[PDB]
């Protein structure tokens, strides 16, 4: 199957003239940052010079911020060494969008991740409940195949249908090796992947949805692992009310 | 509707 890096996207008309072949997935918005539809520091005591050459970890597994999943500001005592600040300065894992068999366009591992690293943020349009219905109503409209919706917190869900990044490629699976993880930055709660274990290069990233289906008909899941529970969504369809937090 | 559903990340 076609392959393609995180620079492939940057170009607008390369890469729409590269989906006319099937060489990239379909065009969406590429934004770096959730963009909302209707709009102290830790305790760590600063490395040293010698600590940072011989290469210590500046607010590392101690820190209280990391701790309360809470990223670092420009004020940490560890300044610009702070290794807490991941998903403001886009300390993403080397990652490509792969063409799956049966499950349209999904993400691969480009280098070896060790287990418990930042791959990519969820990001997209932040949906207030009325907001949310309106684009269920739409896809519904548009007989879409591909979902794109991640519960946030109480009347707040991320559509990444129209406006993303490559995380709206991560693929369901019901043993999969990545999960996501709700991290606060300047008081905003963002969803993130992190490995969940070590994930070898050219593997597939995938995460469990544990999707709550509105939709009558279930998608079965092509993940192939040995505990499939068979569909997306389980047994139980919710109502489009319940499904958005 | 036909399909659909929401995502819902791991209890944090
Ligand atoms: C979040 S999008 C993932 C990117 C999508 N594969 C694409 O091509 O744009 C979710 C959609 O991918 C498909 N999908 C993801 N994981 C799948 C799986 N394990 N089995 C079947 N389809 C899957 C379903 O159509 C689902 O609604
Ligand atoms: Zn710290
Ligand atoms: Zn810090
Ligand atoms: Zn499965």
Same mark, same amino acid.
């Given at each position: 199957?076609?392959?393609?890096?995180?620079?492939?996207?940057?170009?607008?008309?390369?890469? *729409?003239?590269?989906?006319?072949?099937? *060489?990239?997935?379909?065009?969406?918005?590429?934004? @770096?940052? %959730?963009?909302?539809?209707?709009?102290?520091?830790?305790?760590?005591?600063?490395?040293?010079?010698?600590?940072?050459?011989?290469?210590?970890?500046? =607010?590392?597994?101690?820190?209280?911020?990391?701790?309360?999943?809470? @990223?670092?500001?420009?004020?940490?005592?560890?300044?610009?060494?702070?290794? %807490?600040?991941?998903? +403001?300065?886009?300390?993403?894992?080397?990652?490509?969008?792969?063409?799956?068999?049966? *499950?349209?366009?999904?993400?691969?591992?480009?280098?070896? $991740?060790?287990?418990?690293?930042?791959?990519?943020?969820? =990001?997209?349009?932040?949906?207030?409940?009325?907001?949310?219905?309106?684009?269920?109503?739409?896809?519904?409209?548009?007989?879409?195949?591909?979902?794109?919706?991640?519960?946030?917190?109480?009347? @707040?869900?991320?559509?990444?249908?129209?406006?993303?990044?490559?995380?709206?490629?991560?693929?369901?699976? =019901?043993?999969?090796?990545? &999960?996501?993880?709700?991290?606060?930055?300047?008081?905003?709660?963002?969803?993130?992947?992190?490995?969940?274990? $070590?994930?070898?290069?050219?593997?597939? $990233?995938?995460?469990?949805?544990?999707? +709550?289906?509105?939709?009558? &008909?279930?998608?079965?899941?092509?993940?192939?692992?040995?505990? =499939?529970?068979?569909? $997306?969504?389980? &047994?139980?369809?919710?109502?489009?009310?319940?499904?958005?937090? | 509707?036909?399909?659909?559903?929401?995502?819902?990340?791991?209890?944090?």
């Amino acid at each position: 199957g076609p392959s393609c890096v995180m620079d492939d996207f940057r170009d607008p008309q390369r890469w *729409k003239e590269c989906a006319k072949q099937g *060489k990239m997935p379909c065009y969406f918005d590429l934004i @770096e940052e %959730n963009v909302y539809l209707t709009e102290m520091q830790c305790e760590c005591t600063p490395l040293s010079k010698d600590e940072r050459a011989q290469g210590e970890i500046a =607010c590392g597994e101690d820190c209280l911020n990391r701790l309360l999943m809470i @990223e670092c500001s420009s004020r940490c005592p560890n300044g610009d060494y702070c290794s %807490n600040r991941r998903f +403001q300065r886009k300390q993403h894992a080397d990652v490509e969008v792969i063409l799956t068999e049966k *499950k349209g366009w999904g993400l691969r591992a480009a280098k070896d $991740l060790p287990s418990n690293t930042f791959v990519l943020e969820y =990001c997209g349009e932040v949906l207030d409940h009325k907001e949310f219905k309106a684009r269920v109503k739409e896809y519904a409209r548009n007989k879409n195949i591909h979902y794109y919706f991640m519960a946030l917190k109480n009347d @707040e869900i991320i559509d990444a249908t129209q406006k993303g990044n490559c995380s709206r490629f991560m693929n369901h699976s =019901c043993e999969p090796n990545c &999960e996501t993880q709700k991290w606060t930055v300047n008081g905003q709660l963002r969803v993130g992947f992190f490995t969940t274990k $070590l994930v070898p290069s050219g593997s597939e $990233l995938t995460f469990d949805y544990q999707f +709550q289906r509105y939709g009558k &008909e279930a998608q079965k899941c092509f993940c192939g692992s040995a505990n =499939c529970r068979g569909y $997306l969504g389980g &047994e139980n369809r919710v109502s489009i009310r319940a499904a958005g937090g | 509707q036909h399909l659909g559903g929401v995502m819902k990340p791991t209890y944090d």
